[PDB]
Symmetry: C3
Subunit: 96 residues, 3 copies
């Protein structure tokens, strides 16, 4: 049931994607206690996506299923900045 979708205009290689998603899955499992075997995740390369009118690198993260989402947001932002080289200020996490 828990989902995490990372939409990005960064053309992540197949391995960059696995790096980001495995780390986010681990983060969700750790902070929220959800088993890895129930988690669905994806990195959706959207070459046209824009934020603020700019095509500069940007990630939009949707996490579906809560005081600790502050912590989870922090881990996710650090993960994407590392794996995809996105600016933290251009990582936006939405919880649903």
């Amino acid at each position: 049931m828990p989902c995490c979708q990372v939409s990005t205009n960064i053309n992540a290689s197949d391995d960059d994607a696995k790096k980001a998603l495995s780390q986010i899955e681990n983060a969700i499992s750790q902070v929220l206690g959800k088993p890895l075997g129930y988690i669905m995740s994806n990195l959706d390369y959207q070459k046209h996506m824009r934020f603020g009118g700019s095509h500069d690198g940007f990630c939009f993260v949707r996490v579906t299923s809560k005081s600790n989402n502050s912590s989870l947001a922090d881990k996710i932002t650090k993960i994407l900045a590392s794996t995809l080289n996105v600016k933290s200020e251009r990582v936006f996490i939405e919880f649903k």
Copy 2:
């Protein structure tokens, strides 16, 4: 208004996609009584999508617009297993 989106990590050929979607549209029209001319459908190939940490074939179906969704879920699962060769246990249908 009624939508059905099949997200999958299975690289369905153009015709496999039409096979799956025409059959799902027929199923929605039959079980829910919605005219085919109002239905929107799609198969979104998401090469990075993961379930349980695995890239093994998997489909996530979202149907938007209800005792019979049990029946509709059953028809959709059988359809995808046939057309895309996905394991029934790796077909997940969500209604909204």
Copy 3:
């Protein structure tokens, strides 16, 4: 926070996409008063997407964040018909 996603089966060139999205962003900023710097937009080419069972050109627009959405819908429809050569009757705008 405000998002606009245009999903379409029309294989828009990179520039057609920028033409459509910059104009929609301007429309959202003007009608709804949202600053361009807060708006996220995207055009998602979905080659399998169907409406009414047909693969004829079609756009599904989701705008997330209201008497004027009638006006905003009108501007968006005219924009896509111009930039992507879609029939107005095959442009569907959903607000959320």
